[PDB]
Amino acid sequence: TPCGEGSKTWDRFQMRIPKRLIDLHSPSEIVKQITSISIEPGVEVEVTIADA
Amino acid sequence: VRRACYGVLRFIMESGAKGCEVVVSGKLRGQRAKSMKFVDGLMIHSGDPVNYYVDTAVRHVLLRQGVLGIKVKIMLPWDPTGKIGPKKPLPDHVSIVEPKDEILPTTPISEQK
Amino acid sequence: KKSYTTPKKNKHKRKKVKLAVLKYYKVDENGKISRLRRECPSDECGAGVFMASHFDRHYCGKCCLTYCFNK
RNA sequence: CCGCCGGGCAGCUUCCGGGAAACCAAAGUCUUUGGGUUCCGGGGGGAGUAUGGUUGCAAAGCUGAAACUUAAAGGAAUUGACGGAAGGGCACCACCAGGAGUGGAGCCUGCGGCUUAAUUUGACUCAACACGGGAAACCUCACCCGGCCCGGACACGGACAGGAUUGACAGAUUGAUAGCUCUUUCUCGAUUCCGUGGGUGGUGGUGCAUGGCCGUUCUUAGUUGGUGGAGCGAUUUGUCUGGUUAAUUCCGAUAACGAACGAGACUCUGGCAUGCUAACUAGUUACGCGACCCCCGAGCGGUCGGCGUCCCCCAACUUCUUAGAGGGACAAGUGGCGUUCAGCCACCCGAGAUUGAGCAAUAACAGGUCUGUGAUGCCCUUAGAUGUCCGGGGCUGCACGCGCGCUACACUGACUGGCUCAGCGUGUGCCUACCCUACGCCGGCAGGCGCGGGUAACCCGUUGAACCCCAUUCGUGAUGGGGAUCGGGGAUUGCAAUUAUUCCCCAUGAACGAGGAAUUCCCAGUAAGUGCGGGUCAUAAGCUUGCGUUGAUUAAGUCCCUGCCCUUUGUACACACCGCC
Ligand SMILES: [Mg+2]
Ligand SMILES: [Mg+2]
Ligand SMILES: [Mg+2]
Incomplete structure (x- = not known):
């Protein structure tokens, strides 16, 4: 009412x-490939550097 | 009202709709409020289904007199072919693909390849 | 509702006085200007700033209208 | 018995043909007008009255006016809708069988009233009453006792200069260091000011001027069309006797056949998934146990039971946690019952066909909402402003009335030790100034003062709870229940709490010993108790909405009351019986 x-x-x-999250180990290519591809809808992506 | 909303309702069906309706609530050449509703085709009026199938839309209209409401509520026939229409079936609706072949009892025979 | 009686004391909307103001400027013979009365302590109102006699008030008007004292 | 015939009483049936219609072998033969003839009606009342005549022993009988008033009265059928009509069916806003209460007390706050300058105000059976998210010091806030402020857009007019008055630091004052005003004047300087029209708002007015949104008739089974078929045609069947069903849901009888919206299907949810994909932002699990490890404990010692940690990890894994894909449950099997259909009932395997909401049609209703809307019609009001506020005040006031709550009435309990089990959330660092909180001291406590993690599954946080559970008092005393009303302190929030803000610490220490007339709530993890979150929040809830937790009794049917669905029927009702008369 x-x-x-x-x-x-x-x-x-x-x-x-x-929230999903996925651990990985890579250079500054494989991160900047895998993150920029597979974007699009209402999806937020974080990228932690290492450990903390 | 009359000639206009038909002009809309005509169009939206002719465009390619499963069905549609329009409501023009509000005062309408009289000190009293009427409510007018011109309808055509099919329309589901309950369920989750409604949520991703009908295309509801309210808009006012401010006139030299006062205020009417439009309500356009279209039904999408992406049930036939979205491209992959979301779910496609209205869950009620099942499409049984037909026998197609199923010819021949016959005597036995064999073959080799 | 009520209809407002108003205690018969219809309060004054007031004019800020008419006043030509700048006639009282002592031009002693040739061109030279300075009278004496009371003064204000402000910065934009620099030394020339000037005061009075009323039913009390006195005021200084020269940080545009920012700064009148209490006398 | 079977026929025929005349004339009698009657029946059914039909597109004769009639018939406003109901109906009618005749009410048929009628604009295709007249076979013979008798009576008799000309809107309704007044009125079958007055008067006259006559008959009668008389009741009365027969003959029988007008003025006046009056717009329909009436008839046939239609949908409605209501029956103190009838069959069927159904709802715990219904009852039964109960428990819980509720209605009694105190208290809370909701309204009513009175009182009051003011206790703004919407909301009036139900579907108004802790409801407007309505827990209000200040704001809120509109309202009153004031009092300030202008934020007068805009244009149209008026104001070049002996500067239009833009904007004024000590006092009279005033509440105010409001130049808002009574002299003085010292600057911005083209602003200013004064008309006129016109706005601009207004938590002004009107929810019977409206949009949207909501509430509800009503989670009740209903609603609609295409074609047929029936009716000249409104309309009607399809849309239904019965069995069924939570459910015009189905099958079938079937002038209908096959369709559409509602129900159902769906979504979310809630439960079986040692089945899969995995997961240092889960858990971890158990290891391997490699340890510290203190006798933490067992044990002479080997060995073991166990919390904690030392972890980490390059264990290993998903046993519970999490969340993705999955599966499944589908009246699926068997035995009854059933028109042996639609199904119903029992049992097997097992979650037995139903775990709980959201979504919810046609069509409504002066329901509510203009005070949720920069949605707004018109109206008011418009500077002294109902424009916006400061200060205070009120919204809290109190002989009475009702409405939702809580706490009690105690010993299956009261206070005194102790043990010890979560879940849904929630959290900082947020649109304008502001949290969540771990661990140190200090203090009894409120709290205070120290310091720490926290875009969080990490920190709060093995969320370490209450009932509950366990350990002692007490002895049925209005007592230790209860715990109101006041005395006094002390903290905290807040610029400010007077109008006890909120909290603590003292101190006083009430009615109530189960509630008079009534009446709502509901069937399974249900009622009840029980805290706890969330929402409301500076401060803060006796409010709601969620969440577990502890967890009962009893119905498992009926329509007996109340109210709902269909069918048939009656109806002078259609503002629909809360009617008409
Ligand atoms: Mg006749
Ligand atoms: Mg004739
Ligand atoms: Mg007549």
Whole structure:
């Protein structure tokens, strides 16, 4: 309900967010190949350097 | 209203729609509010299916008098051929591919290749 | 609702006074300007800044309108 | 018994033909108008009245006006819709069988009222009442007692200079260091000011001027068309006697046949998956156990039981964790029952055909919403402004009334030791100034003061909880339950808490010993208790929405009340019985 009234019904607004992650060992080619390809839809990609 | 929304509804069907509807709620040549609804073809009105099949769209319209609502609600016939139409089947709908061949009882025989 | 009676004391919207202001400028014989009265301490109001006698007030008006004291 | 014949009482049936229609061998032969003849009606009432005449023993009978008023009254059939009609069917917003309560007390806050300057206000059965996310000091906030401020767009007019008054540091004041105003004047300097029209807002007005969004009739089974077939035609069948079904869902009888929306299918979810793909942002698992390792403990010692760690890892793995692909469960088998169809019931293997929501048609309704909307019609109002605010105040006020909550009434319990089991979340560093918190001291405690991790599956955090569970008091005393109302301190948030902010520490220490008339809630991991998150948050919840946790009794059917679906029927109702009269 906008405003007050009517028998009290609510909605149950949901958004999921699954995280995958993949470890690897490479140079600055294989990272910059594999990351820039396979992009496109609503997908965020992080790239950690090493360990921390 | 009349001639216009037909002009729309005509079009959207002729374009290539499974079905469609238009609603023009609001005051309409009278101090009282009417609600008009001109409909054509097929339309599913429940389920998840609705979510990725109908193309709902509300728009107001602010006129020299007051305010009407448009509601266009088109049904997409990408069920036939999206290219791979998402799911394609409305889950109700099953397509049984037909016997095709299944010829010959006959006497036995053999062959070699 | 109510309809506003108003205690009969219709408060004054006031003019900031008319005033030509700059006639009182002592030109003693040839061209030279300086009178004396009370002064303000501000920077944009540099030394020339000038004061008064009212029913009390006195004010200084020269960091454009920024800075009137309390006398 | 079987025929025929006349004239009698009657029946069915039909596209004669009639018939407004219902119907009618006759109401048939009627614009294709008249076989004979009798009576008799000309909108409704007034009125079968008045008056006159007559008959009668009289009730009364017979004959029988008008003024006036009146727009329909009426008839036949249609859908409605309601029956204190009838069959069928169904809902725990229904009942049964109960428990839990609720309705009683105190307290909370919701409204009503009174009171009050003000207690702004929307919301009025149900589908208004901890609802407007409505837990409000200040803001909120609109509202009152004031009081400031202008943020008067825009244009159109008016104002070159003896500078249009842009903008003014000490006092009179004022609340204010509001030049907002009463002299003084010292600068920006083409702004300014004053008209006119016109805006611009307004948590002003109107939700019967509207958009959207919502609520609901109503998670109830319903709704619709193409072609047929019926009706001159509105309409009607298809759309249904019965069995079935959560469900016009199905099969079948079947002037219908095959279709469409709703239901169903779907999505999310919830549970079987030593089956797969894997995972230092899970777990890890158990190792291998290589250890530290202290007798942590067993044991003379070998050896072992075990938390912790020393880990790391170039173990190994997914046994639980996680989340991807999968599978499966599908009335699937067998035995009843069943028109032996549609299915129903029981049992087998096993999750037995139903784990729980979201989505939800046609069509509605002055439901609610203009105060969620820079959605807004028109209206008001428009500078002294209902434009925006500062300060305060109110929204909290109190002889009464109701509404949702909590806590109790105690000993299956009360307070006194102790042991010890999560889940869904949540978190900083965020759109304008702001968290989550681990571990040190200090203090009783609120807390305080130290310091640490944390875009988080890492840090909080083996989330170390309450009931619960276990260890002692107490003895049925309004008692140690209960725990209101006040006395006094101390912290914290906040610029500020007076109008106890919130918290702590003291201190007082109430009614209630199971609730009068009523009435909602629901069947399985269900009611109840029980904390805990989230939402609300500077401060903060007795609010909701989720989450486990502990976990019952009982129905497993019926329509007995209330209310819903179809069918048949009646209906002077169609503002639909809360009607009409
Ligand atoms: Mg006749
Ligand atoms: Mg005739
Ligand atoms: Mg007449």
